[PDB]
């Protein structure tokens, strides 16, 4: 699993691979690891599939009730706080690393990382999963401030492609989501749409 | 372990175990052992499957997480 | 467990041992000899792990008899005890150790009576009286209470009978019969078995 | 070997009319990491035998060296006698059993394919010394993923041509790429025939990802 | 850390008659829940009067059969005659005990003719304990088939029944029927049944299909 | 497994069952647990069948070599000592052997118990195996040194039968041997069902 | 055990083998592994068989109550949510893994549910010890928007591959075809395996058994 | 291991219009026999029986609790239980102890009331039912019983042939098991009568 | 690691080293043994008495066990080695056979040892 | 290990038990009664873990006496045995399990004499004779050999003496004295202790 | 530890960090991990320090003796083969990951990887150590055929700097060595000479 969220001026760009494994067997090669928590809030799930699914369902339920009560669009910080509270209260029982990314009228695009253990930090960009280790240097050397939405999409696609090439638990297709004020735009990169890097030979 | 003989054939007591004849299949020998969590994304809790209960593997051998 | 006891007098050594050979919960033998005749004036009493006892005791016995055959005189009880301790210590750190507890009783024309205590770790101690087994915990106190260095052999037999009666009264194991032998200047004498019907 | 370090994934074998075809991917995995992506796991033993191995790659290289030296010595004799695929399979079985009995196994699973005297040979040897011949072979995850397809095709059509065998091998490689997490989409196909052993690569299978939109 | 053993299935059956011996086995080789091959007989011809059946760990079976072949050739070289069934059984016992502390995981049954021409069946445990039998089942389905042979061949628990000697045709029918039942109930038995018939005229082989699942 | 042997006036009576087990599965009901080392020595099987068979066959080989070298048959004590020394070399290596060495030598009838642990004791009566406690209970109540031949046969058969009745690992048939001055004889081989018919009814 | 299912152009086809084993011995040669949930929803089961039976029965009862209250046809998403929540709150102690398929107002839906409480919504799924052979068949031959007969043939081929390549699978092939207009519970659908015909006869006659005591009680 | 503590073997067989249930009689602790007349088959109705193999204490507990529930059911419903309903009740009782399981594998044989259609079934220790059409076995010698039954069973057997088949199967299966035997008891359930027989068996 | 063949055959068909050993025996003191009905007597001549020699340390008659004794003639040191080996053999036989050796058994052992020294390299 | 034995005749039950209470290798009590009087015609014999035996036996005894006080009549031996089995089975899986081996002997005015066997797992078996402990192995064969259903109380005492003599001869434990009681239509009668001094 | 070797046309470039750790304590922060096996052959050591040092000493001994016997400059393949033989023979006793790189008159610049286990592979570029996991995507996306010596040096420096930034077991200074026909040029990058990548903030 490799997940990635990057913040640009108007919003955020989310990305994930689609491989779910039971050992070395790929049980689901078209998995959708980008979960919409609200209209403009998504989450990236890594770790135990059951734990992440249950936590995402519970946070969706709580955030929907909270937004209905307040008659106001929810904050990305509020969704991150709910995820953090649930993941910290049950840190011994859950195995869930979450990335919460979304757009706010009051705060704009926001990326929050909630790793295993239950800490919460806002970042310009976040990467998670077993395949994120292989792309730390790439995102460190490639990220720059002021990137547009298209540049953020290309950056996320490149990093995900490299991680999928190197990581055995990552692969399949690249699912991208761009969230801004107008709405959420989703796309799937597959086949030759995935960025290609030539293998060095001889 | 699989090849243990003469322990229970020589006396009803003692830590030694086994019959007169060596037979791993009749004794405790894994044979086609399969992990209860094979074909599963995560490991089942210890004691999830009671001994003797009818159980179907979720996947073939080697698919354990 | 199996029981040994030795009492050293002014001019004699009195030893006894149980005659029970047991497997699991069954006494396979009711008249089992645990004493080994090293020489005309030395007795070895061995208890411990099955197999190890007889192997080690017969090794020591054959070596002592070979010494007597080679040199024309018998080993002294002190020299025999030291030889046994050296062999046991050598085997302890070797590939095949022996788990044996030994009592060495002997009479020397010059040194007089001698009694020796040796645990399975091959530590040798000279004692006026000693015992081996779980029954030692029950009878060593009686020996301490009633033993005197000038005890006659009749009073020694009476003290031994008191210890064996205590074993009958308090020990959880069935130890009905004991073989009794005494060593003095005239050699090894087999006394009457002390039996409890 | 008690703990294999760099391992290869499933290797395939299939007999056809006039020879055998063997397929294996070009990836050496360091656990879950695809570390070496351009290694060859198929070797030409002689003019009539080829070999593909799963498992520890260093043990496979050791076996490569030993088998090559044996073939070199036999050719040095120049007596008109060459090792048959059956003889190579037997020697491999003996070596694997000998290493297993010393509790120092070669952590490999080998597929031996050969053509000699107008007869196709397909042999299997594992690290425990278990050895047998079969019209089709598949180590590792291919025993669960590729072997059923080959067995079904051979049940419907016991005798295959070279083109049909190659197409079926490509289909099995595509399935393995779909469902094996330790596999790669860069593999080699080796064929032994009357004319000798030919190795083709690197090859890639055509993949469909249209179920991602469903 | 690795396991030097693996169970590969297979059931071996032997029946001894007045002047014949039968050694029968299935041809399925498996491992875990997979099938290695469907054509792997477990019966090996030793001499013109002896057949051995081997089931268990397949590598050990191969090594043991090769060792037995070499030993038979050595005996013929040294003694200028072929080994008898009893001599083969005794030598196999010694060979199996030679690895007492790292045993061959093999279930061995020897079927052949004795020196007087009567059928002889010998059954072996992995460390070489053996005795002569009239019939014996070994392998994965041995516990399934042994009681039925006791009922049918031994006429056990049956009253008012004559102990008729076993004929070759009835023995073949019984072997086929018990292997069909074993293929019904045992997951390791199937895909064929190979029957070797030892007589004074030579060794005769017969194959009978079983269900493929 | 139940094996018993006892010395009486007219020799040594050796009896055994014939059941071999693999866990809860009965592998054989016709195992010959009395081993004929030679026309003058007998051995019993308890524990590992292969272990007992192999080591008593080695003992038979050694005894024959001794007879050839010394022009005289080996004694019961010497044979038992040889077997004990043979098995003591593998103490703690997993050997499972409980055996009785029975014979008749210049010293009279001889009965020795030898196990793989290292015990070697001469005695008048012995019982080895998982069902040896029941055989002991019956034999002690029935044993006497002045027993007649047929009474000794009946006592041994009854003790083995009761042991098979109470022990799950004992059963099959009861083999009876009689060690005499001129050599052992095989007395009878009675199935447990026939003994049950004889005794219960 | 081999259970499989596909989504075809107009519904759901579920498949299963009918062999149940206890260890390495076949206990049942005709076992029904496709479980009724609702008139439009069915389920294939794997894992602890008692756990699967009780979980499917409980969810079927709850769905029946829900449909009685609402008065509408049950949804596959409701069954999936109930199953996954119940499985998750037991933390995998209920070792039930399920292939859930059905057709509702939204169309045909297929789910795979695991004992820890994780679900996947896929066009085709496989489960059991023979799941990899059936998955190989699917990856080789599956195409979207198949017809009912083509889907039945594909599921039968997948189950047959599982039966003939896995030691834990065997016997017959059972198919459940679900569409918005009909439901087809085909048991058996195929019989690829049968007992071999007898070559001889066994001895079993009257009076062969000895009887100690006999007591007869007449039922009025 | 826990199931082999006391031994035992229960078998049920289907005839043309009858059912047969058989069990061994030995009660023992590990390798020691205690009694030779332990009851493992319990009547659950006029033509309904349940056989229990496994831990003897769990056998008795399950039989008594099942009798409790069955008596309550028959008092409330005012009718006799159907064998399928009894199987469901046993499954519920066993699954109530899913995490504390009873170490018993029940075997149920009977004729459906008002129809007299033969019914046989077996359950695991946690209550998974398995309704077969030929035979069901349970106990420590299931492999031997499976071999004997698969060899000997025939469709549409008359009660005499059914008795002979089940008797031979049970006898030859327990003759090859160390912790089973010491007699066999067979119940033949017909529409009009029930026959109980004890077989002449080995006692070793 | 001296592996010379000291005792070898000769063209006449003789082992010269064994003959020379017999000649060395011929130079020793006379030893006489007689087997009586219930007694056995051994007598060894003393070639020279120096009136200062300790008689205890030059006894040519020795006991091998409690029931076997022997006398020799030849080289005293070789006899001492043979006597020690025979004593060790008697003790070991009593160990492994639980009975005293017969005279023939220890005679066989001694003769076999001498024969071994007549056909082994480097001695 | 403690020893219980019960023998049932045509109109009586004969029970006996060892009188030894043991801690480690020492016998702390020489006359220790292991029989609990449940009612005027029911005896409970209990062995097992320390503490568990007395607690469970006294709980059962108080419940049986409470039944007698509440209802005016006494529990039958069958009903008392079933009640004991039910309680033991209930405690088996609870947080407070009792490791006790039980023999229930009783006489019913209608059913007659009865003897019941219960292991620590709470499996109840009716037997003509039964025994508990390691000494059961050495005496159940004698009971099988010599018992008949029509045995008189004199011959029953003789058979019990034979079993105890075998225990004296072959058991490795020291069990010198036994308490003997008999239950018939006239109640529980204490017979003379069988002792082996 | 992070080690790296890149091959250009005229030779190879080797680089490594300098941090040696005993747990979380840096026992040596200026370790020299580039070891000259011969005049134009170097090795990069990763794994157990004692094992790598002993194997390097033994290979230097054997290669020097072999070169003196043959009166020829040794081949990089020969040194790699010696390393492979020693590492495969004692794979159950050694924990040593070796990168052998050097220049040959016959074969030019060469890079060989001998990981734990004892296999030998020639690569256009190789990385090793615990820090190499974080720069896999970077070297996959940045490497290209036809780089000069200076480009290879800058590439190795960038990858090593990124790995040192992310890996806790790597750090200190960057030691670079360029090997060609004229000879070996070694340099040390410390302080501001180490390439710097800005930490993303806000």
From Swiss-Prot, chains A, K:
It is an enzyme of class 3 (hydrolase). Its main location: cytoplasm. Keywords: Acetylation, Cytoplasm, Hydrolase, Nucleus, Phosphoprotein, Protease, Proteasome, Threonine protease, Zymogen. It is found in: Cytoplasm; Nucleus. It catalyses: Cleavage of peptide bonds with very broad specificity. The active site is at residue 1. GO terms for molecular function: endopeptidase activity; threonine-type endopeptidase activity. GO terms for biological process: proteasome-mediated ubiquitin-dependent protein catabolic process. It comes from the Eukaryota. The modification Phosphothreonine is found at residue 35. Its EC number is 3.4.25.1. One of its GO terms (cellular component) is proteasome core complex, beta-subunit complex. Component of the 20S core proteasome complex involved in the proteolytic degradation of most intracellular proteins. This complex plays numerous essential roles within the cell by associating with different regulatory particles. Associated with two 19S regulatory particles, forms the 26S proteasome and thus participates in the ATP-dependent degradation of ubiquitinated proteins. The 26S proteasome consists of a 20S proteasome core and two 19S regulatory subunits. The 20S proteasome core is a barrel-shaped complex made of 28 subunits that are arranged in four stacked rings. The two outer rings are each formed by seven alpha subunits, and the two inner rings are formed by seven beta subunits. The proteolytic activity is exerted by three beta-subunits PSMB5, PSMB6 and PSMB7. Belongs to the peptidase T1B family. This is Proteasome subunit beta type-6.
Swiss-Prot record, chain B:
Disulfide bonds: none annotated. Keywords: Acetylation, Cytoplasm, Endoplasmic reticulum, Methylation, Phosphoprotein, Proteasome. The modification Phosphoserine is found at residue 64. Its main location: cytoplasm. It is found in: Cytoplasm; Endoplasmic reticulum. It comes from the Eukaryota. GO terms for biological process: negative regulation of proteasomal protein catabolic process; proteasome-mediated ubiquitin-dependent protein catabolic process; ubiquitin-dependent protein catabolic process. The modification Asymmetric dimethylarginine is found at residue 31. GO terms for cellular component: cytosol; endoplasmic reticulum; perinuclear region of cytoplasm; proteasome complex. Residues 33-65 are annotated as: Disordered. One of its GO terms (molecular function) is endopeptidase inhibitor activity. The modification Omega-N-methylarginine is found at residues 17, 43. Plays an important role in control of proteasome function. Inhibits the hydrolysis of protein and peptide substrates by the 20S proteasome. Also inhibits the activation of the proteasome by the proteasome regulatory proteins PA700 and PA28. Monomer and homodimer. Interacts with FBXO7. Belongs to the proteasome inhibitor PI31 family. This is Proteasome inhibitor PI31 subunit. It comes from Bos taurus (Bovine). The gene is PSMF1.
Curated annotation (Swiss-Prot), chains C, J:
Transmembrane segments: none annotated. It is found in: Cytoplasm; Nucleus. The keyword Transmembrane does not apply. The modification N-acetylmethionine is found at residue 1. GO terms for cellular component: cytosol; nucleoplasm; nucleus; proteasome core complex; proteasome core complex, beta-subunit complex. PROSITE patterns: PROTEASOME_BETA_1, PROTEASOME_BETA_2. Keywords: Acetylation, Cytoplasm, Nucleus, Proteasome. InterPro entries: Ntn_hydrolases_N, Proteasome_beta2, Proteasome_bsu_CS, Proteasome_sua/b, Proteasome_suB-type. It comes from the Eukaryota. One of its GO terms (biological process) is proteasome-mediated ubiquitin-dependent protein catabolic process. Its main location: cytoplasm. CDD domains: proteasome_beta_type_2 (cd03758). The keyword rRNA-binding does not apply. Non-catalytic component of the 20S core proteasome complex involved in the proteolytic degradation of most intracellular proteins. This complex plays numerous essential roles within the cell by associating with different regulatory particles. Associated with two 19S regulatory particles, forms the 26S proteasome and thus participates in the ATP-dependent degradation of ubiquitinated proteins. Belongs to the peptidase T1B family. The 26S proteasome consists of a 20S proteasome core and two 19S regulatory subunits. The 20S proteasome core is a barrel-shaped complex made of 28 subunits that are arranged in four stacked rings. The two outer rings are each formed by seven alpha subunits, and the two inner rings are formed by seven beta subunits. The proteolytic activity is exerted by three beta-subunits PSMB5, PSMB6 and PSMB7.
Swiss-Prot record, chain G:
The keyword Cytoplasm applies. Keywords: Cytoplasm, Hydrolase, Nucleus, Protease, Proteasome, Threonine protease, Zymogen. Its main location: cytoplasm. GO terms for biological process: proteolysis involved in protein catabolic process. Disulfide bonds: none annotated. It comes from the Eukaryota. It catalyses: Cleavage of peptide bonds with very broad specificity. It is found in: Cytoplasm; Nucleus. GO terms for cellular component: cytoplasm; cytosol; nucleus; proteasome core complex; proteasome core complex, beta-subunit complex. The active site is at 1 (nucleophile). Its EC number is 3.4.25.1. The 26S proteasome consists of a 20S proteasome core and two 19S regulatory subunits. The 20S proteasome core is a barrel-shaped complex made of 28 subunits that are arranged in four stacked rings. The two outer rings are each formed by seven alpha subunits, and the two inner rings are formed by seven beta subunits. The proteolytic activity is exerted by three beta-subunits PSMB5, PSMB6 and PSMB7. Component of the 20S core proteasome complex involved in the proteolytic degradation of most intracellular proteins. This complex plays numerous essential roles within the cell by associating with different regulatory particles. Associated with two 19S regulatory particles, forms the 26S proteasome and thus participates in the ATP-dependent degradation of ubiquitinated proteins. This is Proteasome subunit beta type-7. It comes from Bos taurus. The chain holds residues 44 to 263 of 277 of the full protein.
